[PDB]
Amino acid sequence: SQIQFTRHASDVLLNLNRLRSRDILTDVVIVVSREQFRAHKTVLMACSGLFYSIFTDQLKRNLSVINLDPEINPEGFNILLDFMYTSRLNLREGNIMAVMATAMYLQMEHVVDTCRKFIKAS
Amino acid sequence: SQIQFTRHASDVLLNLNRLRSRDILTDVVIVVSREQFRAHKTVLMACSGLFYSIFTDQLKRNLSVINLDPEINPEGFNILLDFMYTSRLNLREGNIMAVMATAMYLQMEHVVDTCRKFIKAS
Numbered sequence: 614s615q616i617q618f619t620r621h622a623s624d625v626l627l628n629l630n631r632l633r634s635r636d637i638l639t640d641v642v643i644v645v646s647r648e649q650f651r652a653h654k655t656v657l658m659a660c661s662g663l664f665y666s667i668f669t670d671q672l673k674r675n676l677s678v679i680n681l682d683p684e685i686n687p688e689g690f691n692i693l694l695d696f697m698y699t700s701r702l703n704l705r706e707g708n709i710m711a712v713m714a715t716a717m718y719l720q721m722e723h724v725v726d727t728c729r730k731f732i733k734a735s
Numbered sequence: 736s737q738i739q740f741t742r743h744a745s746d747v748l749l750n751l752n753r754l755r756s757r758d759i760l761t762d763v764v765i766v767v768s769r770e771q772f773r774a775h776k777t778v779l780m781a782c783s784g785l786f787y788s789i790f791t792d793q794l795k796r797n798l799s800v801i802n803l804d805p806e807i808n809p810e811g812f813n814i815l816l817d818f819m820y821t822s823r824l825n826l827r828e829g830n831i832m833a834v835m836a837t838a839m840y841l842q843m844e845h846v847v848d849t850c851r852k853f854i855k856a857s
Protein backbone atom coordinates (compact mmCIF):
# COMPACT_ATOMS: atom_id res chain seq x y z
CA SER A 614 0.00 0.00 0.00
CA GLN A 615 0.90 3.68 -0.26
CA ILE A 616 -1.16 5.53 2.36
CA GLN A 617 -0.36 9.23 2.76
CA PHE A 618 -1.40 11.20 5.86
CA THR A 619 -1.85 14.74 4.55
CA ARG A 620 -1.70 16.50 7.97
CA HIS A 621 1.15 14.47 9.42
CA ALA A 622 3.94 16.87 8.44
CA SER A 623 2.10 19.91 9.77
CA ASP A 624 1.19 18.04 12.97
CA VAL A 625 4.82 17.05 13.53
CA LEU A 626 5.88 20.67 13.00
CA LEU A 627 3.28 21.92 15.47
CA ASN A 628 4.51 19.43 18.07
CA LEU A 629 8.12 20.45 17.44
CA ASN A 630 7.03 24.04 18.07
CA ARG A 631 5.29 22.96 21.28
CA LEU A 632 8.51 21.32 22.45
CA ARG A 633 10.44 24.49 21.62
CA SER A 634 7.96 26.56 23.64
CA ARG A 635 8.63 24.32 26.66
CA ASP A 636 12.40 24.18 26.01
CA ILE A 637 12.27 20.40 25.58
CA LEU A 638 15.37 18.94 23.88
CA THR A 639 16.46 22.30 22.49
CA ASP A 640 20.20 22.00 21.89
CA VAL A 641 21.38 25.47 20.68
CA VAL A 642 21.09 29.07 21.79
CA ILE A 643 21.13 31.56 18.85
CA VAL A 644 22.54 34.92 20.05
CA VAL A 645 21.50 38.03 18.02
CA SER A 646 22.80 41.19 19.82
CA ARG A 647 21.40 41.01 23.43
CA GLU A 648 18.57 38.65 22.26
CA GLN A 649 18.97 34.86 22.87
CA PHE A 650 16.66 32.26 21.13
CA ARG A 651 16.71 28.51 22.00
CA ALA A 652 15.97 26.09 19.17
CA HIS A 653 16.51 22.58 17.83
CA LYS A 654 19.58 22.35 15.52
CA THR A 655 17.72 19.85 13.30
CA VAL A 656 14.88 22.28 12.58
CA LEU A 657 17.38 25.13 11.95
CA MET A 658 19.35 22.88 9.49
CA ALA A 659 16.04 21.83 7.82
CA CYS A 660 14.95 25.50 7.23
CA SER A 661 18.22 27.52 6.73
CA GLY A 662 21.16 27.20 4.29
CA LEU A 663 23.31 29.05 6.88
CA PHE A 664 22.46 26.72 9.86
CA TYR A 665 22.65 23.65 7.55
CA SER A 666 26.17 24.65 6.35
CA ILE A 667 27.30 25.34 9.96
CA PHE A 668 25.92 22.16 11.65
CA THR A 669 26.82 19.78 8.71
CA ASP A 670 30.50 20.64 9.48
CA GLN A 671 31.73 18.21 12.18
CA LEU A 672 33.93 21.06 13.41
CA LYS A 673 30.75 22.99 14.43
CA ARG A 674 28.01 20.26 14.70
CA ASN A 675 28.27 20.06 18.55
CA LEU A 676 28.24 23.84 19.21
CA SER A 677 25.68 24.80 21.90
CA VAL A 678 25.89 28.56 21.20
CA ILE A 679 25.85 30.31 17.78
CA ASN A 680 26.55 34.07 17.73
CA LEU A 681 24.97 35.63 14.68
CA ASP A 682 25.91 38.95 13.12
CA PRO A 683 25.01 41.56 15.78
CA GLU A 684 23.64 43.85 13.04
CA ILE A 685 20.81 41.37 12.42
CA ASN A 686 17.44 42.72 13.52
CA PRO A 687 16.30 40.44 16.43
CA GLU A 688 12.58 41.00 15.55
CA GLY A 689 13.45 39.97 11.98
CA PHE A 690 15.16 36.84 13.24
CA ASN A 691 12.25 35.94 15.58
CA ILE A 692 9.76 36.25 12.68
CA LEU A 693 11.79 33.76 10.64
CA LEU A 694 12.31 31.42 13.59
CA ASP A 695 8.53 31.42 14.10
CA PHE A 696 8.12 30.76 10.33
CA MET A 697 10.55 27.84 10.68
CA TYR A 698 8.32 26.17 13.27
CA THR A 699 4.89 27.23 11.93
CA SER A 700 4.94 27.61 8.10
CA ARG A 701 3.45 31.08 8.74
CA LEU A 702 5.35 34.26 7.82
CA ASN A 703 4.14 37.43 9.55
CA LEU A 704 5.22 40.35 7.33
CA ARG A 705 4.23 44.04 7.91
CA GLU A 706 5.37 47.25 6.09
CA GLY A 707 7.44 47.93 9.25
CA ASN A 708 9.33 44.58 9.09
CA ILE A 709 9.42 43.43 5.38
CA MET A 710 12.92 44.97 4.78
CA ALA A 711 14.40 43.62 8.07
CA VAL A 712 12.79 40.15 7.42
CA MET A 713 14.01 40.06 3.75
CA ALA A 714 17.60 41.07 4.75
CA THR A 715 17.62 38.53 7.60
CA ALA A 716 16.23 35.78 5.35
CA MET A 717 19.05 36.53 2.90
CA TYR A 718 21.59 36.10 5.71
CA LEU A 719 20.01 32.84 6.87
CA GLN A 720 19.92 31.57 3.24
CA MET A 721 16.10 30.99 3.33
CA GLU A 722 15.78 31.59 -0.48
CA HIS A 723 12.01 30.84 -0.68
CA VAL A 724 11.31 33.48 2.08
CA VAL A 725 13.48 36.08 0.20
CA ASP A 726 11.59 35.28 -3.02
CA THR A 727 8.25 35.71 -1.25
CA CYS A 728 9.48 39.00 0.32
CA ARG A 729 10.15 40.04 -3.30
CA LYS A 730 6.73 38.99 -4.55
CA PHE A 731 5.43 40.78 -1.41
CA ILE A 732 7.20 44.16 -2.07
CA LYS A 733 6.00 43.87 -5.71
CA ALA A 734 2.52 44.51 -4.29
CA SER A 735 3.21 46.79 -1.31
CA SER B 736 0.37 39.85 7.03
CA GLN B 737 -0.43 36.15 7.36
CA ILE B 738 1.51 34.32 4.65
CA GLN B 739 1.33 30.51 4.78
CA PHE B 740 3.85 28.31 2.96
CA THR B 741 1.87 25.16 2.18
CA ARG B 742 4.91 22.89 1.50
CA HIS B 743 7.06 24.11 4.37
CA ALA B 744 6.03 21.43 6.87
CA SER B 745 6.53 18.61 4.38
CA ASP B 746 9.87 20.08 3.28
CA VAL B 747 11.08 20.29 6.88
CA LEU B 748 10.03 16.67 7.43
CA LEU B 749 11.88 15.54 4.30
CA ASN B 750 15.03 17.33 5.48
CA LEU B 751 14.69 15.77 8.94
CA ASN B 752 14.52 12.39 7.21
CA ARG B 753 17.61 13.26 5.17
CA LEU B 754 19.48 14.07 8.38
CA ARG B 755 18.34 10.77 9.89
CA SER B 756 19.60 8.90 6.83
CA ARG B 757 23.04 10.48 7.35
CA ASP B 758 22.93 10.03 11.15
CA ILE B 759 23.18 13.79 11.69
CA LEU B 760 22.20 14.91 15.21
CA THR B 761 20.37 11.67 15.96
CA ASP B 762 20.33 11.37 19.75
CA VAL B 763 18.67 7.98 20.55
CA VAL B 764 19.06 4.36 19.52
CA ILE B 765 15.74 2.40 19.64
CA VAL B 766 16.49 -1.31 20.30
CA VAL B 767 13.80 -3.81 19.12
CA SER B 768 15.15 -7.41 19.60
CA ARG B 769 18.52 -7.54 17.69
CA GLU B 770 17.45 -4.55 15.49
CA GLN B 771 18.78 -1.05 16.38
CA PHE B 772 17.26 2.17 14.81
CA ARG B 773 18.79 5.67 15.31
CA ALA B 774 16.38 8.60 15.42
CA HIS B 775 15.78 12.12 16.72
CA LYS B 776 13.97 12.14 20.11
CA THR B 777 12.03 15.26 19.04
CA VAL B 778 10.51 13.53 16.01
CA LEU B 779 9.71 10.41 18.11
CA MET B 780 7.97 12.62 20.77
CA ALA B 781 6.10 14.50 17.98
CA CYS B 782 4.72 11.24 16.43
CA SER B 783 4.29 8.76 19.38
CA GLY B 784 2.35 8.91 22.69
CA LEU B 785 4.82 6.32 24.07
CA PHE B 786 8.04 8.27 23.13
CA TYR B 787 6.37 11.58 24.18
CA SER B 788 5.48 10.15 27.64
CA ILE B 789 9.02 8.71 28.06
CA PHE B 790 11.07 11.78 26.94
CA THR B 791 8.75 14.39 28.66
CA ASP B 792 9.83 12.77 31.99
CA GLN B 793 13.06 14.47 33.14
CA LEU B 794 14.03 11.12 34.64
CA LYS B 795 14.25 9.66 31.07
CA ARG B 796 14.66 12.76 28.79
CA ASN B 797 18.48 12.31 28.46
CA LEU B 798 18.44 8.54 27.73
CA SER B 799 20.54 7.65 24.65
CA VAL B 800 19.20 4.08 24.38
CA ILE B 801 15.55 2.92 24.61
CA ASN B 802 14.91 -0.85 24.71
CA LEU B 803 11.44 -1.60 23.42
CA ASP B 804 9.44 -4.75 24.06
CA PRO B 805 11.44 -7.53 22.34
CA GLU B 806 8.17 -9.08 21.09
CA ILE B 807 7.65 -6.05 18.82
CA ASN B 808 8.03 -6.92 15.14
CA PRO B 809 11.13 -4.96 13.93
CA GLU B 810 9.70 -4.69 10.36
CA GLY B 811 6.51 -3.29 11.93
CA PHE B 812 8.54 -0.75 13.89
CA ASN B 813 10.60 0.28 10.83
CA ILE B 814 7.39 0.89 8.81
CA LEU B 815 6.12 3.25 11.51
CA LEU B 816 9.49 4.97 11.91
CA ASP B 817 9.49 5.58 8.15
CA PHE B 818 5.89 6.88 8.45
CA MET B 819 7.08 9.22 11.23
CA TYR B 820 9.62 10.84 8.89
CA THR B 821 7.67 10.65 5.61
CA SER B 822 3.87 10.87 6.21
CA ARG B 823 3.67 7.68 4.10
CA LEU B 824 2.45 4.39 5.60
CA ASN B 825 3.40 1.26 3.66
CA LEU B 826 0.84 -1.43 4.60
CA ARG B 827 0.60 -4.92 2.96
CA GLU B 828 -1.61 -7.95 3.86
CA GLY B 829 1.62 -9.49 5.27
CA ASN B 830 2.32 -6.55 7.66
CA ILE B 831 -1.08 -4.87 8.53
CA MET B 832 -1.49 -6.91 11.78
CA ALA B 833 2.17 -6.38 12.91
CA VAL B 834 1.95 -2.62 11.99
CA MET B 835 -1.45 -2.18 13.79
CA ALA B 836 -0.19 -3.97 16.97
CA THR B 837 3.05 -1.96 16.93
CA ALA B 838 1.18 1.32 16.37
CA MET B 839 -0.98 0.46 19.38
CA TYR B 840 2.17 -0.03 21.48
CA LEU B 841 3.69 3.24 20.27
CA GLN B 842 0.37 5.06 20.96
CA MET B 843 0.06 6.30 17.31
CA GLU B 844 -3.80 6.38 17.52
CA HIS B 845 -4.35 7.83 13.99
CA VAL B 846 -2.23 4.96 12.45
CA VAL B 847 -4.25 2.33 14.46
CA ASP B 848 -7.49 3.97 13.26
CA THR B 849 -6.28 3.87 9.65
CA CYS B 850 -5.19 0.22 10.08
CA ARG B 851 -8.82 -0.35 11.15
CA LYS B 852 -10.30 1.49 8.18
CA PHE B 853 -7.72 -0.50 6.14
CA ILE B 854 -8.76 -4.00 7.43
CA LYS B 855 -12.40 -2.93 6.89
CA ALA B 856 -11.60 -3.15 3.18
CA SER B 857 -9.01 -5.95 3.01
Ligand SMILES: C[C@H]1COCCN1c1cc(NC(=O)Cn2cc(-c3cc(Cl)c(O)c(C(N)=O)c3)c3c(F)ccnc32)c(Cl)cn1
Nearest residue numbers: 658659660661662665720721722723724743746747750753
Ligand atom coordinates in the same frame (compact mmCIF):
# COMPACT_ATOMS: atom_id res chain seq x y z
C1 LIG C 1 21.44 19.21 0.31
C2 LIG C 1 19.98 18.77 0.21
C3 LIG C 1 19.72 18.15 -1.16
O1 LIG C 1 20.30 16.90 -1.33
C4 LIG C 1 19.96 16.02 -0.32
C5 LIG C 1 20.36 16.57 1.05
N1 LIG C 1 19.70 17.85 1.32
C6 LIG C 1 19.45 18.31 2.68
C7 LIG C 1 19.43 19.67 2.97
C8 LIG C 1 19.18 20.06 4.28
N2 LIG C 1 19.16 21.45 4.71
C9 LIG C 1 18.86 22.56 3.82
O2 LIG C 1 18.60 22.39 2.68
C10 LIG C 1 18.89 23.99 4.39
N3 LIG C 1 17.90 24.81 3.73
C11 LIG C 1 16.63 24.88 4.07
C12 LIG C 1 15.99 25.77 3.22
C13 LIG C 1 14.63 26.07 3.29
C14 LIG C 1 13.77 25.08 3.72
C15 LIG C 1 12.41 25.33 3.82
CL1 LIG C 1 11.32 24.03 4.37
C16 LIG C 1 11.91 26.58 3.49
O3 LIG C 1 10.53 26.81 3.60
C17 LIG C 1 12.77 27.59 3.07
C18 LIG C 1 12.26 28.99 2.70
N4 LIG C 1 10.84 29.30 2.71
O4 LIG C 1 13.04 29.83 2.39
C19 LIG C 1 14.13 27.33 2.97
C20 LIG C 1 16.98 26.25 2.30
C21 LIG C 1 17.02 27.15 1.21
F1 LIG C 1 15.91 27.81 0.78
C22 LIG C 1 18.23 27.37 0.55
C23 LIG C 1 19.37 26.69 0.99
N5 LIG C 1 19.31 25.86 2.01
C24 LIG C 1 18.15 25.63 2.67
C25 LIG C 1 18.97 19.08 5.24
CL2 LIG C 1 18.65 19.52 6.93
C26 LIG C 1 19.00 17.75 4.86
N6 LIG C 1 19.24 17.40 3.61
Ligand SMILES: C[C@H]1COCCN1c1cc(NC(=O)Cn2cc(-c3cc(Cl)c(O)c(C(N)=O)c3)c3c(F)ccnc32)c(Cl)cn1
Nearest residue numbers: 621624625628631780781782783784787842843844845846
Ligand atom coordinates in the same frame (compact mmCIF):
# COMPACT_ATOMS: atom_id res chain seq x y z
C1 LIG D 1 -0.03 17.24 24.85
C2 LIG D 1 -0.24 17.95 23.51
C3 LIG D 1 -1.50 18.82 23.58
O1 LIG D 1 -1.36 19.95 24.36
C4 LIG D 1 -0.26 20.71 24.02
C5 LIG D 1 1.03 19.88 24.10
N1 LIG D 1 0.97 18.73 23.21
C6 LIG D 1 2.18 18.11 22.67
C7 LIG D 1 2.22 16.75 22.40
C8 LIG D 1 3.39 16.21 21.88
N2 LIG D 1 3.55 14.79 21.57
C9 LIG D 1 2.44 13.91 21.25
O2 LIG D 1 1.33 14.30 21.21
C10 LIG D 1 2.74 12.43 20.96
N3 LIG D 1 1.81 11.91 19.98
C11 LIG D 1 1.97 12.03 18.67
C12 LIG D 1 0.89 11.41 18.04
C13 LIG D 1 0.74 11.36 16.66
C14 LIG D 1 1.22 12.41 15.90
C15 LIG D 1 1.10 12.40 14.53
CL1 LIG D 1 1.73 13.77 13.58
C16 LIG D 1 0.48 11.33 13.89
O3 LIG D 1 0.37 11.34 12.50
C17 LIG D 1 0.00 10.26 14.65
C18 LIG D 1 -0.69 9.05 13.99
N4 LIG D 1 -0.91 9.00 12.56
O4 LIG D 1 -1.03 8.14 14.66
C19 LIG D 1 0.13 10.28 16.03
C20 LIG D 1 0.04 10.91 19.08
C21 LIG D 1 -1.18 10.20 19.15
F1 LIG D 1 -1.87 9.83 18.04
C22 LIG D 1 -1.70 9.87 20.41
C23 LIG D 1 -1.00 10.25 21.56
N5 LIG D 1 0.14 10.91 21.46
C24 LIG D 1 0.67 11.24 20.26
C25 LIG D 1 4.47 17.05 21.68
CL2 LIG D 1 5.99 16.41 21.02
C26 LIG D 1 4.35 18.39 21.98
N6 LIG D 1 3.22 18.89 22.46
Ligand SMILES: [Cl-]
Nearest residue numbers: 647648649650
Ligand atom coordinates in the same frame (compact mmCIF):
# COMPACT_ATOMS: atom_id res chain seq x y z
CL1 LIG E 1 17.09 37.61 25.52
Ligand SMILES: [Cl-]
Nearest residue numbers: 769770771772
Ligand atom coordinates in the same frame (compact mmCIF):
# COMPACT_ATOMS: atom_id res chain seq x y z
CL1 LIG F 1 20.62 -3.79 13.68
